[PDB]
C-alpha cells in the first residue's frame, strides 16, 4: 500500500485497483477548540469538504451508482471522445493525463449516464405483469 494519491503517477489500472485509499482519505474531521478569524476559517472549510463530497455522491446516485467506487453503464463509448484502444489507455496513461484528454467531453458523458439510468428505471416501472 502506497497511501493517499500514491498511485497518481501509476498506470490507470494500477491506480484503479487502489482507488479506495484515495476515496476514503477524502473526508477528515479535525475536532476543535475554538470555543475569531481562525474560527471563521475552520468553519468555512468544514462546509466545503462535505459539500464537494455530497456533490460527487449526488452525481454518483443520479447515474445509478450510489454504492460508490466501481459501476458500469449502458452508454457506449463514442469513438470521438478518444481513439485509443484498451491496452493503451489502461497501461500507458495515468488518470491525470486521461482526465486532461477527456475533459472536453466529460459533461456529455455525464448526461448520457443520467439518461441511460432514467430509461432503465422507466423500464423497471414497466417491468411488472
Amino acid at each position: 500500500f502506497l497511501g493517499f494519491l500514491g498511485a497518481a503517477g501509476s498506470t490507470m489500472g494500477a491506480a484503479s485497483m487502489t482507488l479506495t485509499v484515495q476515496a476514503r482519505n477524502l473526508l477528515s474531521g479535525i475536532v476543535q477548540q475554538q470555543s475569531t478569524v481562525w474560527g471563521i476559517k475552520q468553519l468555512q472549510a468544514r462546509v466545503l469538504a462535505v459539500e464537494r463530497y455530497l456533490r460527487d455522491q449526488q452525481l454518483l446516485g443520479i447515474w445509478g451508482c450510489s454504492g460508490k467506487l466501481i459501476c458500469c453503464t449502458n452508454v457506449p463509448w463514442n469513438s470521438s471522445w478518444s481513439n485509443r484502444n484498451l491496452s493503451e489507455i489502461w497501461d500507458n496513461m495515468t488518470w491525470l493525463q486521461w482526465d486532461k484528454e477527456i475533459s472536453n467531453y466529460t459533461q456529455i458523458i455525464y448526461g448520457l449516464l443520467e439518461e441511460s439510468q432514467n430509461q432503465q428505471e422507466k423500464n423497471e416501472q414497466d417491468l411488472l405483469a
Binding site: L60, C65, L69, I70, T73
Partner: peptide, 8 residues
C-alpha cells in the same frame, strides 16, 4: 462502454 471511478 463508459464506467465511473470514484477516488481517482
Amino acid at each position: 462502454w463508459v464506467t465511473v471511478y470514484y477516488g481517482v
